[PDB]
PDB file of N, CA and C in Angstrom:
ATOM      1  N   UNK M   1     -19.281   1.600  14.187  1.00 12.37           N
ATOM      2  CA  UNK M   1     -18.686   0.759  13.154  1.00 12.37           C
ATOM      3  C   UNK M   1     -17.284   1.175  12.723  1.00 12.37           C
ATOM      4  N   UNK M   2     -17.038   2.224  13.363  1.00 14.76           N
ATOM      5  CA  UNK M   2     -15.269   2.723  12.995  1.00 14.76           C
ATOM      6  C   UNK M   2     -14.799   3.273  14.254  1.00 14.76           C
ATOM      7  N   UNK M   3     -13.460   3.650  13.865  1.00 13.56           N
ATOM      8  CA  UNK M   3     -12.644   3.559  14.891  1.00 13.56           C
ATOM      9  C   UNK M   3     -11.749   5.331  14.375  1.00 13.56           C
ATOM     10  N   UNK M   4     -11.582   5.818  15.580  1.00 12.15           N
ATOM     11  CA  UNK M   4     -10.944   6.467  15.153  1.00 12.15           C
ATOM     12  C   UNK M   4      -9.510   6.475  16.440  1.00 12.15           C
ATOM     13  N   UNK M   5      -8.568   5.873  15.822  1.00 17.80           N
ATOM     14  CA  UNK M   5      -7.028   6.399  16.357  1.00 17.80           C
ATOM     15  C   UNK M   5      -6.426   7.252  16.426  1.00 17.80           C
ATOM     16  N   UNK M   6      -6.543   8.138  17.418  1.00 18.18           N
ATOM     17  CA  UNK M   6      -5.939   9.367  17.813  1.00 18.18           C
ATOM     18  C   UNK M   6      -4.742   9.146  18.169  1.00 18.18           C
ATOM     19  N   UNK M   7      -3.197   9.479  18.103  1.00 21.32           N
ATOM     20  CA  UNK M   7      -2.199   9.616  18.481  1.00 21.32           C
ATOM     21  C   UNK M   7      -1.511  10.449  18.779  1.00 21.32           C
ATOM     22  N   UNK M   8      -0.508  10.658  19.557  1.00 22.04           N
ATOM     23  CA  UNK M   8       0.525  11.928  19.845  1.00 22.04           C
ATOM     24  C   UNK M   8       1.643  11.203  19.321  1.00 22.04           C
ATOM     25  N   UNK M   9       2.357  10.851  20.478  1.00 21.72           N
ATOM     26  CA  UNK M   9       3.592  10.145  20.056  1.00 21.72           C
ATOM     27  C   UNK M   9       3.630   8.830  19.767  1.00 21.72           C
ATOM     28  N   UNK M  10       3.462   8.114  20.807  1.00 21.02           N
ATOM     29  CA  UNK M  10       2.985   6.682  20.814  1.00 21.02           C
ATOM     30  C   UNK M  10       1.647   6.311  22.000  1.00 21.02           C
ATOM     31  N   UNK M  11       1.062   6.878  22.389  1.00 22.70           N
ATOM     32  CA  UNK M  11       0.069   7.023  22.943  1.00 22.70           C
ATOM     33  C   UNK M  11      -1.386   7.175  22.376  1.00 22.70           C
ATOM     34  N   UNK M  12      -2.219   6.544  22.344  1.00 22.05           N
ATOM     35  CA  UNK M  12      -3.414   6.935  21.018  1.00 22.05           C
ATOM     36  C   UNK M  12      -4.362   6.070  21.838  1.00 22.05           C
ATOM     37  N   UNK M  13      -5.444   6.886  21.144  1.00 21.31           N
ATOM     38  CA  UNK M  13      -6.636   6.148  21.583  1.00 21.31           C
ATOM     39  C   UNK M  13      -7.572   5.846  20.527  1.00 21.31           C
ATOM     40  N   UNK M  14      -7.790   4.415  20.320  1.00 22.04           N
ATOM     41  CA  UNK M  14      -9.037   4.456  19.550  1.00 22.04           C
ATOM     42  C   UNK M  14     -10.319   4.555  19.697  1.00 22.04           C
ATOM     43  N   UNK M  15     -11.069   5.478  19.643  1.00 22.47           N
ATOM     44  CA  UNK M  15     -12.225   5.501  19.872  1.00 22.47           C
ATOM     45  C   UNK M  15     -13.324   5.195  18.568  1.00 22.47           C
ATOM     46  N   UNK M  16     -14.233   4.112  19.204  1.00 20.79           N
ATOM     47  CA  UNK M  16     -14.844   3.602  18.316  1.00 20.79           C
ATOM     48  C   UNK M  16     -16.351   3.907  18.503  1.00 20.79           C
ATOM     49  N   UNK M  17     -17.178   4.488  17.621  1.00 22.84           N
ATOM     50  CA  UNK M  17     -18.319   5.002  17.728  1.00 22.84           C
ATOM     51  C   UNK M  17     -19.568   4.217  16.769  1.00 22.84           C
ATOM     52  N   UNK M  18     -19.325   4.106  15.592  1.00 25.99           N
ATOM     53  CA  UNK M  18     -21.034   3.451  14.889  1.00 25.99           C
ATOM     54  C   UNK M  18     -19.693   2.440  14.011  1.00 25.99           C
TER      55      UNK M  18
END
């Protein structure tokens, strides 16, 4: 149900789990 946006510079990942 969330997301989490990881970033460096402009590169990110959202990873979304419950």
């Amino acid at each position: 149900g969330i997301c989490r946006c990881i970033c460096g510079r402009r590169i990110c990942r959202c990873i979304c789990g419950r």
